Amino acid sequence: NVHTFRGDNVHNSSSSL
């Protein structure tokens, strides 16, 4: 739940992946 809050989920889920 917090991943999206502390680094946007790894740069928007690896930018796409």
Side-chain angles (χ1 to χ4, degrees):
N1 62 289
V2 209
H3 200 14
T4 56
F5 189 73
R6 303 173 172 171
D8 72 295
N9 199 269
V10 72
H11 289 353
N12 201 257
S13 180
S14 187
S15 198
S16 205
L17 298 170

